[PDB]
Amino acid sequence: VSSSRWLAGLITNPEWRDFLAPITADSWRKGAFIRIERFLDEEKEKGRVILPPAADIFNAFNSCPFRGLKVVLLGQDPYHDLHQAHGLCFSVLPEVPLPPSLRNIYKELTTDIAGFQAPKHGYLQSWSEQGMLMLNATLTVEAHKANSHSKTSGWAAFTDAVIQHLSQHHPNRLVFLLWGGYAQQKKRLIDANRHVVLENVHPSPLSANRGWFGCRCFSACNEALQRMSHLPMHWQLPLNAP
Ligand SMILES: O=c1[nH]cc(Br)c(=O)[nH]1
Numbered sequence: 001v002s003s004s005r006w007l008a009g010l011i012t013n014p015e016w017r018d019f020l021a022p023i024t025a026d027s028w029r030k031g032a033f034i035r036i037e038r039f040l041d042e043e044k045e046k047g048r049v050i051l052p053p054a055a056d057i058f059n060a061f062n063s064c065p066f067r068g069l070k071v072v073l074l075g076q077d078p079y080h081d082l083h084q085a086h087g088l089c090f091s092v093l094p095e096v097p098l099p100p101s102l103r104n105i106y107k108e109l110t111t112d113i114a115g116f117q118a119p120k121h122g123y124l125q126s127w128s129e130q131g132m133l134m135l136n137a138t139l140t141v142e143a144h145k146a147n148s149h150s151k152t153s154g155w156a157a158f159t160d161a162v163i164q165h166l167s168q169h170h171p172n173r174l175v176f177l178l179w180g181g182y183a184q185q186k187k188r189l190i191d192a193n194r195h196v197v198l199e200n201v202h203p204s205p206l207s208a209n210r211g212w213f214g215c216r217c218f219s220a221c222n223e224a225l226q227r228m229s230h231l232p233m234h235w236q237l238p239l240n241a242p
C-alpha cells in the first residue's frame with residue numbers, strides 16, 4: 001500500500017486500486033510514485049496552477065469499469081486551460097468550446113459511424129463508462145503551458161508501466177487505439193498477439209488530412225471487439241451533457 005500522502009488515494013475505485021497496486025507501491029522504481037507526488041507538491045509550493053484538479057487526475061481509471069475494460073485510447077498530456085480537462089484524454093468539460101482535435105474526431109465519427117450525431121459539447125465520460133480507458137501519457141499540466149510536465153513529472157514512466165501491466169495482466173483481451181507517432185511508440189509495450197493494436201494518423205489539423213479523415217477507426221475498433229466476442233462501443237454521445 002503506497003506511502004504517498006495523497007496521490008494514491010485519488011484512485012478510488014477498488015478494482016483499479018488493487019490492479020494498480022504493484023505500480024503505486026513504494027517499491028516500484030524505488031519510490032517513483034512518491035516522487036511524482038513530491039513533484040506535484042513542489043509545483044504547488046511554487047505557486048503553479050496544476051490541471052486537472054486533484055480529484056480528476058485519475059478519472060480515466062475511476063470512471064472506467066475494470067472488469068468491463070475493452071478499449072484503451074492514449075493521449076499525450078491534458079488540455080491546459082482552466083476548467084477544461086477532467087482526466088480523460090481528448091475530453092473537455094461541458095460548456096467549453098471543442099478543441100480542434102476533438103472537432104476532427106467528431107467529423108470522422110460522423111462519416112464512419114452510420115447515424116452518429118456530434119454533440120455541441122466535448123464531454124466524453126460516457127465512453128469511459130462503457131469500458132474505454134482514456135489515458136494520457138502525462139496526467140497533469142501547468143496552466144496554459146502544453147507539455148510542461150512531460151519531461152519533469154515522471155508520469156510517463158507510470159503510464160508506460162500501466163500499459164505494460166494491462167497488456168500482461170488484464171483479464172480481458174483489449175483493443176488499443178494509437179493515434180499519432182507519440183502514442184504509436186507504446187506499441188512495443190503491448191502484446192499484439194493477445195491484444196489488437198489499431199494505429200492511425202493523429203486527428204489534430206497538422207496531420208488530419210494526411211490520413212485521419214476516412215480512416216474509419218471507430219468502426220474498425222468495433223469490428224475488432226465483435227470478433228473478440230466483446231460488446232461494441234456505443235459511440236453516440238449524449239447530446240445534453242451532465
Ligand atoms: O487529453 C488530451 N487532449 C488532447 C490531446 Br491532442 C491529447 O493528447 N490528450
Ligand SMILES: [Br-]
Nearest residue numbers: 099100101102
Ligand atoms: Br486539440
